[PDB]
Symmetry: C2
Subunit: 286 residues, 2 copies
Amino acid sequence: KYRVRKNVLHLTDTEKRDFVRTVLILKEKGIYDRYIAWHGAAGKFHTPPGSDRNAAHMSSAFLPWHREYLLRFERDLQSINPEVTLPYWEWETDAQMQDPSQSQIWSADFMGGNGNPIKDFIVDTGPFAAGRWTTIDEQGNPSGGLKRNFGATKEAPTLPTRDDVLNALKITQYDTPPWDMTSQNSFRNQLEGFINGPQLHARVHRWVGGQMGVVPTAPNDPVFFLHHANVDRIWAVWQIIHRNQNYQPMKNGPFGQNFRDPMYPWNTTPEDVMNHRKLGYVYDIE
Amino acid sequence: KYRVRKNVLHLTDTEKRDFVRTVLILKEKGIYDRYIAWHGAAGKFHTPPGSDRNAAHMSSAFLPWHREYLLRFERDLQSINPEVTLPYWEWETDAQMQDPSQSQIWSADFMGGNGNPIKDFIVDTGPFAAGRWTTIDEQGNPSGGLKRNFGATKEAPTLPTRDDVLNALKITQYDTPPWDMTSQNSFRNQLEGFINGPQLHARVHRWVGGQMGVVPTAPNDPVFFLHHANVDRIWAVWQIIHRNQNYQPMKNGPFGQNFRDPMYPWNTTPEDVMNHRKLGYVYDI
């Protein structure tokens, strides 16, 4: 309950500055790349092999894998600076703006802005501009810089709304068999956003574009983490409401997706991360 | 020092049968796939990005990485059967045998034999034949079928012979700058065997062929663990003579290669695994 994860737009100038700084250090020290690598790895670990589900997406473990991932990330930032916590991008409220791209999250003193179309949508502003931040392709090699292309797709011209979120929050079952993108009346699947997709979580990657657009390279963009802190918060809100509902499948789901299964690439189980206040942190809306 | 890792050739038919069983169980629980995936993932963690090194290969972490790998895998074994330990394939003594292709490691009760030349070198004997044992590819997809092709390579027709092993043990430095395939008088590099190679481990992989022949798909063959166990033993002997010798680099190499750097994909550091008896195991004799 003691680490408070704040809304990006509530952050003081110093709070934005300490966070970015800490992230650059984690990058310099070789530690940031392990997080990109972990995400890449899990997306190749299919549960079961041959299936479309994998350790981190398209199945029940999506939510707790990503809670674990962020917990480990936050813990590394705290090593560098015990005051820094991971904030969250409330992308449902940005959606309301006339022009979401004007959100303060994209200012030069934070995340940087949209890509430069003269340079194939390479981001050239902010602390993660090409030249001040190296990216890595899907096979581990340098790839030349951050690319964003806000709202350029036909499928996702816009961010998800405050209504889409509230609607997801109403769902009663955490997940339903067959624990896949075709799982109906699932909170997890609705959050992930595949049915009549892309919606919610899928829509955010698609809106942003560049690396964030493709899911295996997405963590090259720091905003990946602010975005996931918002999905983690949404989950957390859902647990508060329907506290008679638990993780599913408890058993007889595919190995890697059950409550007490190891979540590759770690030994951590979904059970070990169901209670988020146990893990040391809470979101500011509580 | 409790558990004792035993030469494959010093195993009873009941020890052998028990090892194979555990593996096939470990496979069915979907746990063995975690090991294949980990090894593949370590290949793509370059240290630093754009370099020749990765977290598990072609740099100094190679030895401690694989010791941690085998240790975690033996623990998993122990959890199905507390009496089952990793054996080690002493490939230097098999080299000295008219036909090693008929070592008792390739029996029809243990690993099975060499690939059949009529079925694209698919293994069609033993517990890991096609139809009983499924494989995964570099991507994580299904490949189906484990190929083996002994000495079928002009670059490596022979097993590391003995004296190869005695000569790597005289090298005095664990490893040397720049800590890679051009490291000189490096114990680590001689033993990886890329330098003026393939010689030893870089030679064992190519000697077996099939999925062993390429190194991201190597763990799909069970013998991989047999192989590295022998490797981790050669290191253990080096750590007895050159006891004082330790680990390089200690600080200032690439992240993921130093004494105190976490070894991707785990948090384990080379330091944590330097002393193998403190990991609760030991090799026979």
